[PDB]
């Protein structure tokens, strides 16, 4: 039941400020000093900054030193980042740790918060566009061009799930993301029967059904 | 300026199986060092903290001896459960530094990936732009080893991967490879190829297809 309860993130262009929040459950924040932690797509852990119990210091990783500010009220049984001057490499799902030692530092972290992503970049919130990939053959859909994460696919209104992947989206250089999204299917069956694909991206409130089909 | 380094990056064993990874610190740190278990879009876990003592839930199989630079994590018989990643962390100095972790992925046998390149559609085409798509599905293990090849020229900065997490059911990856031109350019060309060579492939497979 123990558990650090995390808010605030979302997506902000170069320059501009955001703040985080984690609120403490079940127990009192207001003895155990404050670690975050940050995780770049796909990269590993990053420290970032940490607040002794009363908040007298404030110890902060190299990479965000002068830029983000950790703080504590200790009434709202809540600790805060705030992270100003804000640069695309910090784009990463932040981590607000308990300390394992409060009323003292030990340096270790024994419960984690659910994790909140940050974006940071100039794109603007856009839709995909929704490509088909034609075709025991392979068939898919491409997603391109869509800002920002995350977006979801389903095949035939969520009834095709055997043999589907969904790979992971990349960041183009251009600043949006693309994706596809495959089914492995029996070859007698291409004219048969129907196979749709259902793009959601609910940041451009963009829902999008295409019907692959053969040459 | 204290640098971790852990070691292998990427470890593959199967369940059951006696599992050690490294990690050493490019100065002095005594003792104190966690590890970490992480899970695909989950938070970290603590583990192990000064080295070798266990936190409280853990299983006995999970050992860690270390001291001065040179660490080490041991699951002794490796359970289903046991597969993430590990993060170790020195706690000496600050500013506090993780390692970059290692994953330990599940082992089968070798798989063949099966091969499939799709054209651009006319639709993409329209917009003035042109994905070229090159499938490589469920095979083992994750190296390979895709080369696209445009009227027989081998091409290079154009097209980007991406692959997925280990199968639950089979263990098996499975990648896409695109290559991204401008419609002009794409039309400057007949022949378009990606060639895969694989661990469990003879020699390399090559998928062709001729624009028009």
């Known amino acids: 039941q123990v558990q650090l309860v995390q808010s605030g993130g979302g997506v902000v262009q170069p320059g501009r400020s955001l703040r985080l929040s984690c609120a403490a459950s079940?127990?009192?924040?207001?003895?155990?000093?404050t670690h975050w932690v940050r995780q770049a797509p796909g990269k590993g852990l990053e420290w970032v900054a940490l607040?002794?119990?009363?908040?007298?210091?404030?110890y902060y990783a190299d990479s965000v030193k002068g830029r983000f500010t950790i703080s504590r009220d200790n009434s709202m049984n809540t600790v805060y980042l705030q992270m100003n001057t804000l640069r695309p490499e910090d784009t990463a799902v932040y981590y607000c740790?308990?300390?394992?030692?409060?009323?003292?530092?030990?340096?270790?972290?024994?419960?984690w918060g659910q994790g909140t992503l940050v974006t940071v970049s100039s794109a603007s919130t856009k839709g995909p566009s929704v490509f088909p990939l034609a075709p025991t053959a392979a068939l898919g859909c491409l997603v391109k061009d869509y800002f920002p994460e995350p977006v979801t696919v389903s095949w035939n209104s969520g009834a095709l799930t055997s043999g589907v992947h969904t790979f992971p989206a990349v960041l183009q250089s251009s600043g949006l993301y693309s994706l596809s999204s495959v089914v492995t299917v029996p070859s007698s069956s291409l004219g048969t029967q129907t196979y749709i694909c259902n793009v959601n991206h609910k940041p451009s409130n963009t829902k999008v059904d295409k019907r692959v089909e053969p040459k | 300026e204290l640098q971790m380094t852990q070691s292998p990056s990427s470890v593959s064993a199967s369940v059951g199986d006696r599992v050690t990874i490294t990690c050493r610190a490019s100065?002095?740190?005594?003792?104190?060092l966690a590890w970490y278990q992480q899970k695909p879009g989950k938070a970290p876990k603590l583990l192990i903290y000064?080295?070798?003592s266990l936190q409280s839930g853990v299983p006995s199989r999970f050992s860690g001896s270390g001291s001065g630079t040179d660490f080490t994590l041991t699951i002794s018989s490796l359970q289903p459960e046991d597969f993430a990643t590990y993060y170790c962390?020195?706690?000496?100095?600050?500013?506090?530094?993780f390692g970059g972790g290692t994953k330990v992925e599940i082992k089968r046998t070798v798989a063949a990936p099966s091969v499939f390149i799709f054209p651009p559609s006319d639709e993409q085409l329209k917009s003035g732009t042109a994905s070229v798509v090159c499938l490589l599905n469920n095979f083992y293990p994750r190296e390979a080893k895709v080369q696209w090849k445009v009227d027989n020229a081998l091409q290079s900065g154009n097209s980007q991967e991406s692959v997925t997490e280990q199968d639950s059911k089979d263990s098996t990856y499975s990648l896409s490879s695109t290559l991204t031109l401008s419609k002009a350019d794409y039309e400057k060309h007949k022949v378009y190829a990606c060639e895969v060579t694989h661990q469990g492939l003879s020699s390399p497979v090559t998928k062709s297809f001729n624009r028009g």
């Open positions: 100065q002095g740190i005594s003792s104190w």
């Open positions: 607040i002794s119990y009363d908040g007298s210091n404030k």
């Open positions: 962390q020195q706690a000496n100095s600050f500013p506090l530094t």
């Open positions: 740790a308990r300390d394992l030692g409060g009323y003292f530092i030990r340096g270790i972290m024994d419960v």
């Open positions: 079940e127990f009192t924040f207001r003895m155990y000093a």
């Open positions: 000064a080295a070798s």
